[PDB]
TrEMBL record, chains A, C:
UniProt entry keywords in alphabetical sequence: Hydrolase, Multifunctional enzyme, Purine biosynthesis, Pyrimidine biosynthesis, Transferase
GO terms, molecular function: IMP cyclohydrolase activity; phosphoribosylaminoimidazolecarboxamide formyltransferase activity
Organism: Methanosarcina acetivorans
Span of domain MGS-like: 1-145
Keyword Acetylation listed: no
Enzyme Commission no: 2.1.2.3, 3.5.4.10
Family: Belongs to the PurH family.
Gene: purH
Pfam families listed in its UniProt record: AICARFT_IMPCHas (PF01808), MGS (PF02142)
Protein name (Swiss-Prot/TrEMBL): Bifunctional phosphoribosylaminoimidazolecarboxamide formyltransferase/IMP cyclohydrolase
PANTHER family: BIFUNCTIONAL PURINE BIOSYNTHESIS PROTEIN ATIC, BIFUNCTIONAL PURINE BIOSYNTHESIS PROTEIN PURH
Domain of life (superkingdom): Archaea
Transferase as UniProt keyword: yes
Biological process, per Gene Ontology: 'de novo' IMP biosynthetic process; pyrimidine nucleotide biosynthetic process
TrEMBL record, chains B, D:
Location of the region described as Disordered in the Swiss-Prot/TrEMBL record: 1-23
Protein name: Large ribosomal subunit protein eL43
Subunit note: Part of the 50S ribosomal subunit.
Flavoprotein as UniProt keyword: no
RNA sequence: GACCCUCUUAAGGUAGCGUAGUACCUUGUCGCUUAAUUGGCGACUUGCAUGAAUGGAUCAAUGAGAGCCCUACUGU
RNA sequence: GACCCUCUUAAGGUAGCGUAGUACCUUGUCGCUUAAUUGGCGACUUGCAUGAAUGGAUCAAUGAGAGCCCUACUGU
């Protein structure tokens, strides 16, 4: 039950109706300032805080109020005698509902210098208190901080009669949380403006325990973020499939990031094992792409996280049949397809993400370094300047041939000779990796050809054209483009690249001997552009 | 160039003619089918996007008058394109 | 100057002295509740809050007052009309010094069920207000939430005369932050106990702008957690060295982890490169230790960073001389080594950690999976049971070898085949790894065996003994211990290892066909003990 | 078994006899040297930790009476052990 | 009063400290300390003429060292 | 009133909902709504005799459908 209500809301959004409701249910509205005004200008009678405390008015709009000795009435039980009596004293009131929101703090920057004085000036002192006080009342007073919960409240009251304990709880907690946020802001800003030591608070609310961890005794627990952002695991639905775990989330996110670097347009897919997107593809109709990645990795594969860029269809669903996948991400799905997989399989952690084909909404990452939390500015910028120095230059199409590395070598582990090369009519997928091992060259030393040709192998083996293995491989190996990581160390390594007939490496420029990198590229004939964007993903 | 796509207006699409009737799922299905059918379709005779549906399964090119039989809501179907590509692969082989 | 002192410090530490100090310079002490007594007993004359804010007080211990236009006095600018106005009124005081800490929130599960009632009824409400009010005064009034800095304040006052902007600033910032801390707790607990969500509120102080990240423009800061457990990159001692990048920090984590994973023990180190175990072995001095962990790595090497448990001196710094090293993590450090490294190769980022070797101190770890963050427990579990299902069990010598791997392999990015083999009886060393290769068998193909033999080669030739390579290997070819993640997939793969003689493999418990795998290693007699640890470290 | 190692008492060690004199660095050096010299040292004749310093460079075993010349503050030095191991390697080789 | 040039007849003061036991102007300006202080301390500092083993800054403990202040004490 | 057994002559109610248009006892107990309510709504629920296409729960919009309440209105 609510008998009196203190509506000192900074943000007035929708207070008029809440007020109307309460009044219609008798609830006297004891409010002051902005609110009070709006209410008396909207045909809602409202008593002023003057007829409660012994405190007039000054700078209405933030503080001007508080309640000593007396807050202890609403406190943690506005009916608990010892508690109760304090708030109501002499003409004071036994308000059983207080709604106090706080305008979000902001410093900004003026034309003549940070407006520190006024900006800081407006730190609500009354409000927050009223909140904490009321809030503590896990019983009696029903605190209404967040403005987007006047409905729920009203409905409950209009019906039931008494805001249930459950509700009271939720509300109170939320209020405390709101004040927490407020203070946090007050910290971050000030620590960045006034002094220099900056403080970064994190956004990890609503928790959920998973299975365990890397081992059975390594319990992990996903903590969702309240942020509305955009594409994120927090907003994905496990249609069917046993509860995803640590590894699950991890790789799934890496996959998402991979497919999100290519930004809409061209159909694309991906896959991944042990935090390694080992199968990006673009192409046209998914079908091909999908399987092309499965060719990319036909070993490990079994139990990866397919991450397509749109809805999955039966065509490749029948291809997926038998080829065990851990999780299948997708912006949406088709009924028959979904059903099909669902019933046939018994393990696929189908986790299509509702609407992921838009803006990610984040630009920072937080690598936990046992007492450290960095804030890398999310950037995938293909190149800073396209300046092929080597005598052999890249024509626009060979340019794309190269660009595809950047496109994936970023969105996947580095120290990998990413051989993004043609495979589908005017659509280039990454062919070979490097599997991030010791020296940069070590990548090619046990990859490049290693993967490129394993793939070629499977393809050839299957369709056995007249072009015997040697010239078969050559078919594309002579035109291959490798834009491996950033600036590839020296020159004989690049020679090894040319060795594999790939007369098209790509190197951002500026390693141990850039002049020699050029010299060699000229000699060999390795066309390589000096992009400058080291793709590693830190 | 298009309508006033308000902060909330991008869901109903052509199914806004149905109001609050028939359910979100069927409204979405019908809207998606309408979008796919109203998308431009390239004429296989003149190679320009002037193929529009003249009836249930009949499609006509506004430029060259090329009229043909296709899908009910799509001028070209995946099965038909698969058949065409199979025969093209055979013809290339021989 | 500062002539009034409202000190209602929940925590009654330091107040005695502070109060006397004040009384000496003058500064009327207007405290109440607890403080009042303690001081008026120690001797320090104290006036009760009763005769300031219009109406008295209530339930001493937390509540006290909460008066609007009295908190607005202290608030900010007690000398600027509008604001100052609330520090005068009707006997209303213009208090200029406030120090009121907040006893931390707690839940204290009672023998008869969680004391939620009391808990909630002990969340200080009065405190936070007074505090945040005073705090607000970046100008005039000075607030000292933290009790552990009464000295600094007193000092300044005594000497200088009036407090300094610099100080007032820090004081305020800190006070707000403290109230934040309070709120945070009030949310977290109550959000788990009352409701059932786990709000993870984190704060990383000591923000230090660094180099970058992936991009040369990927600005990120090494926000230093204020955790005072033990081993912490933040609280380091960079003898000399440019600001180390994200990369360095991370690999620092890596090596710190591995080195401490081995429980230090007989002179051990942990060389690390491209966040992949690049060295791990024990010894009787760092001479051997160092080279026992550098030995197994003839590839990556150059560009790595040492993480030790004893002392790095010029003795082994001779071989080191040239061998490119980015960072040093020496608990103890020799002056001459220090000096040499200093000039020698500038690169040496000498980031010794003051007696780094302790117990980690934290129990959790995080991985910001962009859209959330997990909470993986600080587990150090090294084995379940020690028992070879295969009849032929481990001799103490090879048990020690296994025990060895356990540590490294557990602190080694997995999907590999960790082949640590004895370099010096009792003092082990790594001989293989396998950075996330497709299938475990492919890993043993392009890692373990290969790197083991190449190592053996490097060793044999380097130190040229009588015994010729082939037999030099022969001697311990089987002895070679490899735990590798967990259960090696099948038996034929284990037999491939036996092909490379390697008749000593560790296999936790639960392989893809344990039944068979056992049979096989039993017939072969391969000492295949069943540790049980699904280390599978990523 | 040892002293009352208080919350703050574990720094001075045997250099607590110097009070606040001589500086933390030299106090630490002297304390570490004292700890190393007072550590148990195994007798090369009876293989038990009974070797104590009798003078500047003289070390004696309390059990078997084996007395020898070693380091000033350590019974065995790294250079001497290196020489011994070199000659042992030669002797094994031949 | 930053920044290209200079005058550069080798170079043109880095970290710090600063009216100093170094500051002529000088009892420099401001704040605390006093009723009032060429004082002491703190800050600022246009440094006549500070500055890194001609060692710079700083400093717990120690001092029959040199100043200023509070308390107690008193024929000072 | 959880848990091993039963009686199990196939099995022994999962998700939900619950005094229901289903609840005999019954005008069930409590809270709002009234001065007062076998009423309505909400919660609890020991379900005589709820429960998943004998479809369960829920529901925006729609309704000459069925109840209860507020306001306005009035010879009801």
């Amino acid at each position: 039950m609510v008998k009196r209500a203190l509506l000192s809301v900074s943000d007035k959004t929708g207070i008029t109706e809440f007020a109307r409701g309460l009044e219609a249910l008798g609830v006297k509205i004891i409010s002051t300032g902005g609110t009070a005004k709006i209410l008396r200008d909207a045909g809602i009678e409202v008593t002023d805080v003057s007829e409660v405390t012994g405190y007039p008015e000054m700078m209405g709009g933030r503080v001007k109020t508080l309640h000593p000795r007396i807050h202890g009435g609403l406190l943690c039980l506005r009916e608990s005698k010892e508690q109760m009596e304090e708030a109501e004293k002499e003409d004071i009131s036994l308000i059983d509902l207080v709604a106090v929101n706080l305008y979000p703090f902001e410093i900004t920057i003026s034309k003549e210098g940070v407006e520190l004085e006024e900006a800081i000036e407006n730190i609500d002192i009354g409000g927050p208190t009223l909140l904490r006080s009321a809030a503590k009342n896990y019983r009696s007073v029903t605190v209404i901080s967040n403005p987007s919960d006047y409905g729920h409240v009203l409905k409950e009251l209009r019906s039931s009669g008494i805001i249930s304990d459950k509700t009271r709880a939720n509300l109170a907690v939320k209020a405390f949380r709101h004040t927490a946020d407020y203070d946090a802001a007050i910290d971050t800003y000030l620590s960045r403006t006034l002094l220099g030591e900056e403080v970064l608070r994190l956004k990890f609310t609503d928790g959920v325990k998973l299975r365990y961890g890397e081992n059975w005794h390594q319990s992990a627990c996903f903590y969702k973020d309240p942020g509305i952002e955009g594409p994120s695991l927090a907003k994905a639905v496990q249609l069917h499939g046993k509860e995803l775990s640590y590894n699950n989330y991890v790789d799934a996110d890496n996959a998402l990031q991979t497919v999100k670097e290519l930004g809409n347009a061209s159909p694309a897919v991906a896959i991944v094992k042990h935090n390694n997107p080992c199968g990006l593809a673009t192409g046209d109709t998914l079908l091909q792409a999908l399987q092309a990645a499965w060719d990319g990795d036909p070993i490990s594969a079994y139990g990866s996280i397919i991450c397509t860029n749109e809805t999955f269809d039966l065509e490749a669903a029948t291809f997926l049949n038998g080829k065990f996948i851990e999780i299948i991400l997708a912006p949406d799905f088709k009924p028959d397809a979904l059903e099909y997989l669902k019933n046939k399989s018994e393990n696929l952690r189908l986790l299509k993400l509702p609407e992921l084909r838009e803006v990610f909404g984040t630009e920072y990452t937080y690598k936990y370094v046992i007492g450290g939390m960095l804030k890398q500015s999310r950037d995938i910028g293909i190149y800073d300047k396209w300046e092929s120095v080597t005598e052999v230059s890249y024509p626009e199409g060979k340019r794309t041939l190269s660009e595809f590395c950047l496109k994936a070598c970023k969105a996947t582990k580095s120290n990998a000779v990413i051989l993004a090369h043609e495979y589908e009519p005017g659509y280039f997928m990454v062919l070979g990796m490097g599997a991030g091992q010791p020296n940069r060259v070590d990548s090619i030393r046990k990859l490049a050809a290693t993967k490129a040709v394993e793939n070629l192998k499977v393809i050839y083996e299957r369709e056995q054209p007249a072009v015997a293995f040697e010239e078969y491989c050559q078919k594309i190996l002579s035109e291959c483009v490798m834009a491996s990581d950033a600036f590839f160390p020296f020159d004989d390594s690049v020679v090894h690249a040319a060795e594999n007939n790939i007369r098209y490496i790509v190197s951002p420029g500026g390693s141990i001997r850039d002049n020699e990198v050029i010299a060699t590229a000229n000699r060999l004939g390795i066309a390589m552009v000096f992009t400058g964007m080291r793709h590693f993903l830190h | 160039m298009a309508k006033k796509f308000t902060k909330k207006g991008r869901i109903s699409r052509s199914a806004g003619r149905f109001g609050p009737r028939y359910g979100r799922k069927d409204r979405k299905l019908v809207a998606d089918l309408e979008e796919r059918m109203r998308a431009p379709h390239v004429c296989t005779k003149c190679a320009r996007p002037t193929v529009e549906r003249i009836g249930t399964g009949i499609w006509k090119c506004s430029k060259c008058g090329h009229t043909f039989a296709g899908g009910t809501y799509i001028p070209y179907t995946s099965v038909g394109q698969t058949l065409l590509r199979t025969m093209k692969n055979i013809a290339e082989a021989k």
